[PDB]
């Protein structure tokens, strides 16, 4: 626990139970382009291209693609401000960030509603995410629903 490159890693760089071994082919078949969104997860079975332990699990953006490295931009919290960092990692340490898929589907579907309303004279009725407000009203039936009486009950010791 002195100040080194790999300090205090006992449960962060341990491979989980019944999952040892070299990774598979579905990692290597993926591609990355400039402007995507990528999270970082260390696979502790290769020793060429590991980043520092601080960046384990933070999402960034991809700006360059090299023959052996990918470039990711991030944000670190140095004493006062929020700065800008760049790192080069290998392909076996990344993962495609989901979470824009429900957003990018909403872009493609709203773009279709705008197109069909050009042929008509109506105003646009876009798709936006729902809101939750006060509790709405409902209707209960007392034909098949019977109330159950609830009351207190005397205390009984466990033995």
């Amino acid at each position: 626990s002195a100040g080194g490159y790999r300090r205090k890693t006992r449960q962060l760089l341990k491979q989980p139970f019944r999952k040892h071994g070299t990774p598979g082919l579905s990692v290597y078949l993926a591609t990355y382009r400039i402007g995507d969104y990528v999270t970082i997860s260390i696979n502790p079975s290769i020793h060429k291209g590991m980043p520092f332990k601080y960046y384990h699990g933070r999402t960034g953006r991809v700006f360059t693609v090299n023959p052996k490295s990918v470039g990711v931009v991030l944000h670190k919290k140095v004493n006062g401000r929020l700065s800008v960092k760049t790192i080069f990692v290998r392909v076996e340490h990344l993962k495609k960030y989901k979470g824009r898929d429900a957003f990018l589907e909403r872009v493609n579907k709203n773009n279709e509603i705008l197109k069909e309303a050009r042929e008509k004279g109506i105003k646009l009725e876009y798709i936006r995410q729902k809101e939750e407000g006060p509790r709405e009203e409902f209707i209960l039936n007392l034909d098949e629903n019977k109330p159950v009486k609830v009351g207190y009950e005397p205390f009984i010791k466990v033995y």
């Binding site: 809101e131 939750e132 006060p134 509790r135 009203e137 209707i139 209960l140 039936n141 007392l142 034909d143």
Partner: protein
């Protein structure tokens, strides 16, 4: 009352809707407070004691 009585004859309950707004009153002074409860009191415009506002009720 008329929609409640017409559902009464068919043994229906008809619980109505909630109110649309609330009334918020500040009572205790806020000199020594935690940083989060200081931030929420700023967003409700409640810097002065014995003051009231109006707020829409949502899930948030």
């Amino acid at each position: 009352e008329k929609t409640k009585s017409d559902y009464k004859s068919k043994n229906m309950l008809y619980i109505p809707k909630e109110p649309n707004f609330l009334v918020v009153v500040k009572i205790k002074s806020s000199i020594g407070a935690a940083p989060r409860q200081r931030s929420i009191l700023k967003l409700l415009r409640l810097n002065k004691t014995n003051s009231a506002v109006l707020v829409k009720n949502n899930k948030s």
